[PDB]
Amino acid sequence: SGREEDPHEGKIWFHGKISKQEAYNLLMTVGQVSSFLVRPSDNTPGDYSLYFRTNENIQRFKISPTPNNQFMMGGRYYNSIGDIIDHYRKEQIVEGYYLKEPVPMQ
């Protein structure tokens, strides 16, 4: 390809080229409740946004890199975005909810 890609390009849950409205519409059509996807942040270069579908709405969470190869979400630190997804498949992300299926990059 000759490109240097985002380090998360090719991960099933990563969408590097959609809008926030497209994220909403994908989660409501392709996704199901507890589905999720990750986008680069629209407003903070270098950050990422995790979108999560509950029974009644979509929630957006900030993931921010540290200077030392880690990522911060909810005041906790993880070695990768994949580790954040592993964490919230086993611990509730919103009361009553875990991460279930990714919305695959379309």
Add this chain to the structure above:
Amino acid sequence: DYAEPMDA
């Protein structure tokens, strides 16, 4: 803005 997770 952004939501905070349950275990924040």
